[PDB]
Amino acid sequence: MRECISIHVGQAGVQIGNACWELYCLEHGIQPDGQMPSDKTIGGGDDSFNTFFSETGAGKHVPRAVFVDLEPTVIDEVRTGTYRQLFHPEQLITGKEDAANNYARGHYTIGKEIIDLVLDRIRKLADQCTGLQGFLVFHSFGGGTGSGFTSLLMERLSVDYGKKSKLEFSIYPAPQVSTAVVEPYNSILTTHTTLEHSDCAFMVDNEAIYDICRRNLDIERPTYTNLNRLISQIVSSITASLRFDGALNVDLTEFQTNLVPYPRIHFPLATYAPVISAEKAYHEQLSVAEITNACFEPANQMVKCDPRHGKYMACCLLYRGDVVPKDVNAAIATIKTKRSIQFVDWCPTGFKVGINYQPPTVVPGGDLAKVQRAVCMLSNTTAIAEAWARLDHKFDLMYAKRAFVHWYVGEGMEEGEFSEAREDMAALEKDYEEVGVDSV
Amino acid sequence: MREIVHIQAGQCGNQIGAKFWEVISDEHGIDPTGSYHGDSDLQLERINVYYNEATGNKYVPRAILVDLEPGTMDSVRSGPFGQIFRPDNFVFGQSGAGNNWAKGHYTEGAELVDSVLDVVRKESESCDCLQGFQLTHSLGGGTGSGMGTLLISKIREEYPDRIMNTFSVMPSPKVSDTVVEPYNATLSVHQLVENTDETYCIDNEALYDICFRTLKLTTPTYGDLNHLVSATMSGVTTCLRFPGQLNADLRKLAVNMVPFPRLHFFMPGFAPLTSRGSQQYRALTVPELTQQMFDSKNMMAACDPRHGRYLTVAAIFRGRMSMKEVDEQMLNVQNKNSSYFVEWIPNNVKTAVCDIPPRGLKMSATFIGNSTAIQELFKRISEQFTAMFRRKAFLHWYTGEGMDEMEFTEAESNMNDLVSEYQQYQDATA
Amino acid sequence: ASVKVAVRVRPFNSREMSRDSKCIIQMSGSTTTIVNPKQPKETPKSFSFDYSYWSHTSPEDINYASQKQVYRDIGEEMLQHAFEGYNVCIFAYGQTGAGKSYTMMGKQEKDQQGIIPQLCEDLFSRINDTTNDNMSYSVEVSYMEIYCERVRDLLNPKNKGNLRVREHPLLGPYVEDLSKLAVTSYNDIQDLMDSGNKARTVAATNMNETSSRSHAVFNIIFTQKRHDAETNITTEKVSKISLVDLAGSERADSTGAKGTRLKEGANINKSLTTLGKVISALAEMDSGPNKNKKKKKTDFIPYRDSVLTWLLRENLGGNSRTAMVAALSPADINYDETLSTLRYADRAKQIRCNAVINEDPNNKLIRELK
Numbered sequence A: 001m002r003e004c005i006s007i008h009v010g011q012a013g014v015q016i017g018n019a020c021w022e023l024y025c026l027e028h029g030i031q032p033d034g035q036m037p038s039d040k041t042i043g044g045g046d047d048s049f050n051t052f053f054s055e056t057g058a059g060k061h062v063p064r065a066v067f068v069d070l071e072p073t074v075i076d077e078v079r080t081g082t083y084r085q086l087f088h089p090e091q092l093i094t095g096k097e098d099a100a101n102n103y104a105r106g107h108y109t110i111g112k113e114i115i116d117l118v119l120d121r122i123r124k125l126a127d128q129c130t131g132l133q134g135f136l137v138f139h140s141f142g143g144g145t146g147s148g149f150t151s152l153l154m155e156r157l158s159v160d161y162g163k164k165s166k167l168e169f170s171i172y173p174a175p176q177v178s179t180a181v182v183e184p185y186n187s188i189l190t191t192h193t194t195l196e197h198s199d200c201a202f203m204v205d206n207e208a209i210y211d212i213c214r215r216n217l218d219i220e221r222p223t224y225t226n227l228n229r230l231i232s233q234i235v236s237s238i239t240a241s242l243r244f245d246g247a248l249n250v251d252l253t254e255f256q257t258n259l260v261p262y263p264r265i266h267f268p269l270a271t272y273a274p275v276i277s278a279e280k281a282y283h284e285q286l287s288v289a290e291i292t293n294a295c296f297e298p299a300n301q302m303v304k305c306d307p308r309h310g311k312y313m314a315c316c317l318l319y320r321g322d323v324v325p326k327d328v329n330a331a332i333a334t335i336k337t338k339r340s341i342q343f344v345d346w347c348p349t350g351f352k353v354g355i356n357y358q359p360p361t362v363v364p365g366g367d368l369a370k371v372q373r374a375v376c377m378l379s380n381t382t383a384i385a386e387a388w389a390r391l392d393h394k395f396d397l398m399y400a401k402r403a404f405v406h407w408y409v410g411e412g413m414e415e416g417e418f419s420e421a422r423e424d425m426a427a428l429e430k431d432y433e434e435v436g437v438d439s440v
Numbered sequence B: 001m002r003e004i005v006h007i008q009a010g011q012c013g014n015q016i017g018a019k020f021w022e023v024i025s026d027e028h029g030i031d032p033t034g035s036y037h038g039d040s041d042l043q044l045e046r047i048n049v050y051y052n053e054a055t056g057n058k059y060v061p062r063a064i065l066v067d068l069e070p071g072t073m074d075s076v077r078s079g080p081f082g083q084i085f086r087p088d089n090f091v092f093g094q095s096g097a098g099n100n101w102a103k104g105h106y107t108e109g110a111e112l113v114d115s116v117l118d119v120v121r122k123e124s125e126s127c128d129c130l131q132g133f134q135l136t137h138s139l140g141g142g143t144g145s146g147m148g149t150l151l152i153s154k155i156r157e158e159y160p161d162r163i164m165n166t167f168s169v170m171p172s173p174k175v176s177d178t179v180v181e182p183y184n185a186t187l188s189v190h191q192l193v194e195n196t197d198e199t200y201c202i203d204n205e206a207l208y209d210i211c212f213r214t215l216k217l218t219t220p221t222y223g224d225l226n227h228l229v230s231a232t233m234s235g236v237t238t239c240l241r242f243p244g245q246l247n248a249d250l251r252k253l254a255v256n257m258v259p260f261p262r263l264h265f266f267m268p269g270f271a272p273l274t275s276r277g278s279q280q281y282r283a284l285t286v287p288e289l290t291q292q293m294f295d296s297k298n299m300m301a302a303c304d305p306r307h308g309r310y311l312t313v314a315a316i317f318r319g320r321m322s323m324k325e326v327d328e329q330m331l332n333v334q335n336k337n338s339s340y341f342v343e344w345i346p347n348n349v350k351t352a353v354c355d356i357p358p359r360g361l362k363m364s365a366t367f368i369g370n371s372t373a374i375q376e377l378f379k380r381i382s383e384q385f386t387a388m389f390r391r392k393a394f395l396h397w398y399t400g401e402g403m404d405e406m407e408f409t410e411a412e413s414n415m416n417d418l419v420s421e422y423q424q425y426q427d428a429t430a
Numbered sequence C: 001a002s003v004k005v006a007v008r009v010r011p012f013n014s015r016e017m018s019r020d021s022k023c024i025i026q027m028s029g030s031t032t033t034i035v036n037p038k039q040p041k042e043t044p045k046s047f048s049f050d051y052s053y054w055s056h057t058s059p060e061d062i063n064y065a066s067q068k069q070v071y072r073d074i075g076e077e078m079l080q081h082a083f084e085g086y087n088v089c090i091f092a093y094g095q096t097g098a099g100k101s102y103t104m105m106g107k108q109e110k111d112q113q114g115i116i117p118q119l120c121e122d123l124f125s126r127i128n129d130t131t132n133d134n135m136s137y138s139v140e141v142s143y144m145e146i147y148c149e150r151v152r153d154l155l156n157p158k159n160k161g162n163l164r165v166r167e168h169p170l171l172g173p174y175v176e177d178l179s180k181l182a183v184t185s186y187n188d189i190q191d192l193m194d195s196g197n198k199a200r201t202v203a204a205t206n207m208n209e210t211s212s213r214s215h216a217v218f219n220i221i222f223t224q225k226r227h228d229a230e231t232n233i234t235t236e237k238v239s240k241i242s243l244v245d246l247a248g249s250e251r252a253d254s255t256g257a258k259g260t261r262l263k264e265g266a267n268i269n270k271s272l273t274t275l276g277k278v279i280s281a282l283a284e285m286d287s288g289p290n291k292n293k294k295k296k297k298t299d300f301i302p303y304r305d306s307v308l309t310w311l312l313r314e315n316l317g318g319n320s321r322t323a324m325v326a327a328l329s330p331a332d333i334n335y336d337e338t339l340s341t342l343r344y345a346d347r348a349k350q351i352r353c354n355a356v357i358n359e360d361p362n363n364k365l366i367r368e369l370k
């Protein structure tokens, strides 16, 4: 009963959740109305997998999810869409205004009056669960709701449950492309919550996925749907070990134990190797060695940072489909001899391997090809510091003149908090600069 | 009548145990349902060693399956020989150790050890005259290392006189499936050296080398490695189940192979291995078995014997053969390779002969070596341990469960002392 | 270091008196001769110890070695020699009913006292003689026993569990949660010894009605300070004096132990063998580098093979002075056992360790900072 609770906050969270639940329903053969005729035809099995779906008396399967937002529009789209019957009607939506890209508005003033009810529903879900593994929180840096309400929610969750694992999937601001003027303020404010309370957070950049779509899938005018589908594939690869049998199964505790050297350095990158279109799926062997090599390419990373400028501190490979341990062994041996990939001298092993028999599924109307073999990598490295550094500069350029600060302080936020928040990132940045130094 | 109680912990231990129970079951003609459909009388002469009689004239293996994750139990039950094991011996919990030795030893396993010992105490009480135990577990993981070491300690407190075997898989030099292998390996080796009578060292690198170079398999899987290991385990205890010219229980090996109490780490091997198509060329004879036994690449431990000296070795032959040929072959192996055997142990080759070979073969042989080269393995692990302990790479995961740096220091010191003790005799001219 | 193998012969015993009571041990000065009862014609086995003693005829004075003579030849000499920063290890190696306690304790009420009364009272009188405003001392004691590779506390109340042996990275092996005490006077040491001796496990056998089935250890940690602060540094000395009693080898043919007794005897013999091996090895090692060439390539001493040698790692060798009292008997039944004891003595009696330790960092830090 390897259960885990999904929470979605903000527009980005809700849309990524839509993609994720489409993928999950496709994976387990659950109809959009919650029925599973495959089990009726077969007559038995554990296809009502408890990792995501709770099975009621009549055979309907309710997902273990809590969508949260302040804009009625995004949730109302789900409540009258294809999957209107799938979710429990309690969708946790505020019939009021929204944070409007304001951390203080979403954390102090309007974040209240919804936190109690959301926590009540989360506790109600947790009561039904046995042997809960952890929480998967989807949100986005920059947005008012996804920053402030996520901060409040994670603080309360750390107070209440504490020991249970918590994983963040988030959309970090990009180096140049942005859809708001006050993104740096929100990110710099929410660093404290994503640093102190979360156990492991993955950063995702929009331009990285756009470049992947342009180069690999040959999509020329992608929208958010394709990015959400790729992120859903990432999350499914992460969570596959809990659902299906495999030669080497890696649950969440092993993953955290291997990828996190120190408490404050839990910011790994993520990537997916066999991202390829159906047209280009041919003319390609797509062996284990090829996908393992492709995982290391700087171009295929999901965050705009060059791993060559940093040091690899830990890795975790999760394979799916027709994979044999000998080929993974050979690929890792080939990788270790490459000189472009530098490993910190205090981690001689620096690899975790997981293999699963269930191959990835193909969503109808998607862009990814059907492949009998795939691998998803998580890599804890020191290059991520660069991704923070640029943002810090931007924040300074806006804080020297106190631009837009009156909006934040008008919602009960104290000015000095801004400075404090910046200091945290500085300290965090310094930690990376200390951990990559070779021993003497 | 001499009974062996079998224990298996962790994923690797459970897999090897399942394959081993398939192999032994064939030798003694046991159906998957438990009924006996053999031909020879000798198959039932000593069935009691590994099996208990049931009231319905069916045989239940005397095994304890242990884990902290129901997945491996479910995999074992839903298998070709899943129904053979009795359901009461499936002892497990939830929230597995997850490659954390402290969780396996202190936090999680301590809650489950009581239940496990209870089954063991029951199984043991039924036996007429218990010889010893044997445990299968990989040292690289959390559940295996932790719960195996804890069970070994508890059993040695409870049963000091009996024998304690161990078929453990060490971390490999190059291949590494986990990031925190050295910590678990060091702590497990610290626990094993004090509370065991024998310990057979197995390495996945060596087994893959055997599969590629010798057997010429193209795409080996864990099934083949478990096949090799299970062949070795069945070879070791052959003399307690069939007659022969010279018998040799587990103790007779322990006495003949262990000169000093702390040197009980053995390198196993098996012969023949004809690679599925070359058997028609080579003629199976005793000298061929000796040659393939004493070959360097045939060892399962990934340590070259030629880099050290043989403290003492044992050869268990199975089949109809002459004693003169065996004795002269062992003498010739001693005399030819005079520099690879110590000088203060004359005639350091134990020999046992059984006259009931495996079903598909005319002859076979099992090799157990005790050399000084094994220290290399530990030395390697020690280096990696230091490389992660100077900076405390992943220490916060362990210290959160109650351990402290002092225990790591004790483990490192004990491992280094063992390495020095092994290096004491690897020299020339004194 | 040293081992000063006190080869001592006690009066006869009822078990011996039942047989032909004829002593087979004689001497002349430092020369010790032992006759073969089965081959009296043969020249007696001859040894040259400076510390061989004969107390089978107590009232005699001609060539008679009183306990005061033993203390003068070993006790105060070893004490003063090791007083300049050493660890002193006195232990009793012998056989069952071989009079291993009268060496260790002796007649407390009489002036014919064992090694511990003389040593402890002499040390206590010494510190009292040098007790002053600017000269002070501090003494601590501890007691423990090894049953069968398991450590137990005798001073502390009944703790049915076994103490866990740990290894401090700098301070070496020690016993976790072992009860340790501070002591002011000699009579307190006597009372603690009485309590500890009562606490130990004891069982009866043919060779001795009250044989001890455990290996007992008695540690003394003794610190000395002088406080001439103008031109002297406090806590200028510390010493470790370890007094250990070792159950003798169980001659199973001469005892006929059965059941648990046999098991105890088995463990005892195993432990003793390991100890003997260490005493044989250590000697040779310290004989080689000190005499031969100064190479110091590498030498391994098997400490870890047993708990006794493991806990006494600091005291048995390395940087410690030692001492053995070979408690013999004049019987013919014990000739082979006596020969084994003195053959291990031939593999002992120098040990040759080095030391000089115990400064006061904080007190000199006053001068350094000023």
Ligand SMILES: CC(=O)O[C@H]1C(=O)[C@@]2(C)[C@H]([C@H](OC(=O)c3ccccc3)[C@]3(O)C[C@H](OC(=O)[C@H](O)[C@@H](NC(=O)c4ccccc4)c4ccccc4)C(C)=C1C3(C)C)[C@]1(OC(C)=O)CO[C@@H]1C[C@@H]2O
Binding pocket: B022, B023, B026, B027, B215, B224, B225, B227, B228, B231, B234, B235, B272, B273, B274, B275, B276, B277, B279, B358, B359, B360, B361
């Ligand atoms: C045509 C022919 O010669 O067939 C042989 C054969 O080719 C060889 C290659 C067999 C074959 O073994 C393998 O191919 C193999 C593959 C991976 C790992 C291990 C073995 C054989 O499968 C193995 C089989 O032997 C047995 O079955 C033994 O009794 C073995 N039992 C099992 O393998 C077994 C497997 C599942 C269930 C029950 C038993 C055994 C060995 C030691 C102790 C007890 C049992 C034999 C003679 C053969 C085949 C069939 C090809 C060999 O088997 C052994 C015992 O190692 C490989 O080395 C020998 C040499 C044989 O010549």
Ligand SMILES: Nc1nc2c(ncn2[C@@H]2O[C@H](COP(=O)(O)OP(=O)(O)OP(=O)(O)O)[C@@H](O)[C@H]2O)c(=O)[nH]1
Binding pocket: A009, A010, A011, A012, A013, A015, A016, A070, A071, A098, A099, A100, A101, A102, A106, A139, A140, A141, A142, A143, A144, A145, A146, A171, A178, A179, A180, A206, A224, A225, A227, A228
């Ligand atoms: N990958 C991806 N990113 C998205 C998506 N939708 C929004 N984003 C990101 O989210 C940022 C906007 O912040 P949001 O979290 O959506 O703000 P919100 O959730 O509506 O909360 P408010 O700020 O109060 O409106 C944009 O800059 C986008 O980069 C999406 O569908 N996919």
Ligand SMILES: Nc1ncnc2c1ncn2[C@@H]1O[C@H](COP(=O)(O)OP(=O)(O)NP(=O)(O)O)[C@@H](O)[C@H]1O
Binding pocket: C010, C011, C055, C056, C058, C094, C095, C096, C097, C098, C099, C100, C101, C102, C103, C208, C210, C211, C212, C246, C247, C248
């Ligand atoms: N020099 C001596 N003069 C008089 N009596 C002595 C002398 N030496 C020993 N004894 C006596 O002889 C006995 C020796 O003690 P004993 O009963 O053998 O204990 P023990 O043998 O040391 N116990 P153990 O050796 O550990 O099994 C005691 O009764 C002593 O009083």
Ligand SMILES: Nc1nc2c(ncn2[C@@H]2O[C@H](COP(=O)(O)OP(=O)(O)O)[C@@H](O)[C@H]2O)c(=O)[nH]1
Binding pocket: B009, B010, B011, B012, B013, B015, B016, B097, B098, B099, B138, B140, B141, B142, B143, B144, B145, B169, B176, B177, B178, B204, B222, B223, B225, B226
């Ligand atoms: N030979 C063999 N080795 C295995 C098998 N499964 C896992 N291993 C090895 O065991 C190690 C992982 O240990 P694991 O079984 O997870 O320990 P646990 O988690 O405590 O149960 C890896 O290094 C693998 O090489 C198997 O079926 N056969």
Ligand SMILES: [Mg+2]
Binding pocket: A010, A011, A070, A071, A098, A099, A100, A143, A144, A145
């Ligand atoms: Mg919004």
Ligand SMILES: [Mg+2]
Binding pocket: C097, C098, C099, C100, C101
């Ligand atoms: Mg005595």
